[PDB]
Symmetry: C2
Subunit: 324 residues, 2 copies
C-alpha cells in the first residue's frame, strides 16, 4: 500500500476566523480498512458552502479535519460501485486524502471543468433545480425574483427561469455582482439591496404587476418586502435564510393564497441523473453559464471559508487541493 | 309595494386597535320592498347574520363605508326578485346587509334543505364549514394516523376541522381560551387533547407535551406567538394550512414571526388559502356533511345573539373570545 504525507485543515476550536482552523501534516496509508466497504480518495476540489457555519459550533470536532462536499479521484475501493481511477463527488475531508465510508456520486462527463461538480454539476446545481423546477412549479411568462442571485444556487435559478421564458430579477450586494447578473447571467433586471432604502418599493419598481415566484435564500426584511409584492397564487421556495429578525407580513399568505415551502436538496438526489440530462447539453451549448472563485491549495482553505460569510466569493467558492 | 321601517347596523367610524360597541350604531330608515325598474336585484328579509373575524379587516381604510350598513354573510328570505333564478319565498344565504331588509345583486346560494336549523347556513353549512372542509381536506393533504393541531379550535371553523381529522383517524389536539371551551373540545367535539393557551407558561413546551413526536398538520387560525411555537414542533414534511391569524387583526403593527428557518430543516409546506376559491366543492361538502349532522356523527355549537341591537356586541366579542362556537345574530322572529 502507498503511504504518503497528508495535509489536513483541522478545526482548532468551536466557533469565524482563520485562527479557528489549523493546517496539520500527518502520514496516511492509502488502504481500505480491513473488511470495510470504504473508499480511499485523493481530493481534487473542495467546496465552501454556507451550511458549514452550522457545523462549527452533525457538528465538526475540534482536533479533527473539517468535512464538506468535494471532487476526488478514487485510489482504492472496498465497494463494488467504485474502482481505482473513478472521479467522484460527495462528502469528503478537508485534506489531501480521505477514507470515505459507505454512509457519493460517480462522475461520467469529463468534458466540463471538474470544479463544476462542486457547483453547477454538484450540490448547488441540484439545489437550484430541485427548488426552481420542482418546488416552484414554474410556468413560461411568470415573474421570478431571486435573492442572493449571484451565489452558487441563485445564479443558476435565474438562468433556469430565463430558459423557461420567465421575467427574472435578482438582488446582489455590489455593483460588480449586479452588472454580472445582467451581463453574464441574462437576468432581465437586478438591484443592489444595500443601496435600497425601501425594499418593498424597489420590488414594486421591478415588478409592476407583482412576483409569481420568489426563490428565497435570504429571509427577514427581504421576505417581508417580497410578501407584499406577490401575485395571487404566488410560490416561495424557501432554500436558505443566509441573513439569519421577525417576519411581519405573513397575512399576505392568506390574501394572496401563497404557497411557501421549504425543501432540502438531499431529498431530491434521485432526480440528479434527470438534472444532468437537462443541464449538461445546455452548458456545452453555452446556454447556461457558471462563475466560481477558485483558491489554490489547502493552506488557502481557511481564508476561503471565512470569506464566504461576507460575500467575498463571486459564485461558488472552491479550493483546488490538487491538479489532475 | 310594501313600505316598512328598516333597522340597520351602521359602521360609525374606521377602527384602529380593538373594535368597540360604540364604533357602530343602529339607524332606522323607511324603505319600499320593490325591485328597481328593469334591474335583476333581489329584495330579501334577513333572518340570520354571521359574525366573522375577517370583518375587522373591513373596518380599516373592499372595506366598509362609515355611515353605511355593515355587510356580511347571512341567511334571508326572498320577497321580490328581478332574477329568474330566485322566486318569492326562496331561502338563500350569501352576502347581505346588517339590516332587517336588503336589496342584493345576485353568489347567493339557494337553501333546499330546511330539515336543519336555518342558522346553520351561517356556519357549518355556510362559509365557515366550507373553510374547514377546503382547508383540511384540500390544503392539509391529511392521511390517517397523522398528528393534527388546531388553534381557535372551539370556533366556527376549528370545531369542524378537529371533527374532520378525527373522522380520518388522526390524533387531534386543540387550543382554546377558557376551561369551558377546552372541556367542550374534549367532551363534545371528540378532540384527543386540548389546552387553554392562556394558562401555559411556554406554548412550545405545551405543544411538545401533547405532541412528543411532533405535529404533522397545523390548521392555523391565530398566528403570532402560537405559530412560532408550532414551527419548532412540526414533523418532517409537516403542513400548515394558513387560514387565519386572528391574534394579529387588531394590532397596528403585527408581531414578528421568528422561526421560519424550521420550514427548511423540516421541509414544511405553509400555504394560505381563501374559501372563496373552493366553492366548486360546496355540493360535495353539503352532501357529505348534512347526513353526518342528521346522524349525530358531526356536531356543532353556535352562539345566537338576539336582535340587530345585539349585533355590535356579538361582533366585538369575537376578539375577546366571548363567543362559544360560531357567533350568529338572529334578526327576525
Ligand atoms: N435547502 C437546501 O438544501 C440548500 C442547499 C444548498 C444551499 N442552501 C442555502 O442556499 C443559500 C444560498 O447558497 P449558495 O451556496 O448559493 O451561497 P453563496 O454562493 O454564498 O451565495 C450566498 C450569498 O448571499 C448573499 N448574502 C450574504 N449575506 C447576506 C445578507 N446578510 N443579506 C442579504 N444577502 C446576503 C451573498 O451575496 P451578495 O454578494 O449578493 O451579498 C452571499 O455570497 C444559503 O443560505 C445556503 O445555506 C440550501
Ligand atoms: N381563509 C379563509 O377563507 C377564512 C374563512 C373564514 C375564516 N377565516 C379565519 O379563520 C379563523 C377562525 O374563524 P372562525 O369564524 O372560526 O372564528 P371563531 O373561532 O368562531 O371566533 C374567533 C375566536 O378567535 C379566538 N381569538 C380571538 N382573539 C385571539 C387572540 N388574540 N389569540 C388567540 N385566539 C384569539 C377566540 O377563541 P378563544 O376563546 O379560544 O381565544 C374567538 O372565539 C379566523 O382567523 C378567520 O379570520 C378564514
Amino acid at each position: 500500500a502507498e503511504e504518503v504525507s497528508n495535509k489536513q485543515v483541522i478545526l482548532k476550536n468551536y466557533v469565524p476566523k482563520e485562527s479557528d482552523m489549523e493546517i496539520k501534516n500527518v502520514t496516511i496509508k492509502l488502504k481500505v480498512p480491513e473488511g470495510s466497504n470504504d473508499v480511499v480518495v485523493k481530493n481534487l476540489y473542495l467546496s465552501c458552502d454556507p451550511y458549514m457555519r452550522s457545523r462549527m459550533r452533525e457538528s465538526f470536532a475540534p482536533g479533527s479535519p473539517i468535512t464538506g462536499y468535494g471532487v476526488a479521484k478514487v485510489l482504492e475501493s472496498g465497494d463494488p460501485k467504485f474502482q481505482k481511477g473513478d472521479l467522484v463527488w460527495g462528502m469528503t475531508g478537508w485534506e489531501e486524502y480521505s477514507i470515505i465510508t459507505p454512509t457519493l456520486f460517480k462522475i461520467h462527463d469529463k468534458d466540463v471543468p471538474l470544479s463544476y461538480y462542486t457547483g453547477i454539476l454538484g450540490m448547488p446545481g441540484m439545489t437550484a433545480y430541485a427548488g426552481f423546477h420542482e418546488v416552484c412549479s414554474p410556468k413560461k411568462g411568470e415573474t421570478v425574483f431571486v435573492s442572493a442571485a449571484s451565489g452558487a444556487v441563485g445564479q443558476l435559478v435565474g438562468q433556469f427561469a430565463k430558459m423557461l421564458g420567465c421575467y427574472v430579477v435578482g438582488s446582489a450586494g455590489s455593483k460588480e455582482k449586479v452588472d454580472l447578473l445582467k451581463s453574464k447571467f441574462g437576468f432581465d433586471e437586478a438591484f443592489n439591496y444595500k443601496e435600497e432604502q425601501d425594499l418593498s418599493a424597489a420590488l414594486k419598481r421591478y415588478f409592476p404587476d407583482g412576483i409569481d415566484i420568489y426563490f428565497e435564500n435570504v429571509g427577514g426584511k427581504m421576505l417581508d418586502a417580497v410578501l407584499v409584492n406577490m401575485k395571487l397564487y404566488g410560490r416561495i421556495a424557501v432554500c436558505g435564510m443566509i441573513s439569519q429578525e421577525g417576519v411581519h407580513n405573513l397575512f399576505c399568505l392568506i390574501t394572496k393564497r401563497i404557497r411557501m415551502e421549504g425543501f432540502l436538496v438531499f431529498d431530491y438526489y434521485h432526480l440528479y441523473p434527470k438534472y444532468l440530462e437537462m443541464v449538461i447539453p445546455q452548458i456545452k451549448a453555452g446556454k447556461v453559464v457558471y462563475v466560481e472563485d477558485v483558491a489554490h491549495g489547502l493552506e488557502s482553505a481557511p481564508t476561503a471559508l471565512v470569506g464566504l460569510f461576507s460575500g467575498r466569493n463571486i459564485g461558488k467558492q472552491v479550493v483546488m487541493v490538487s491538479r489532475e
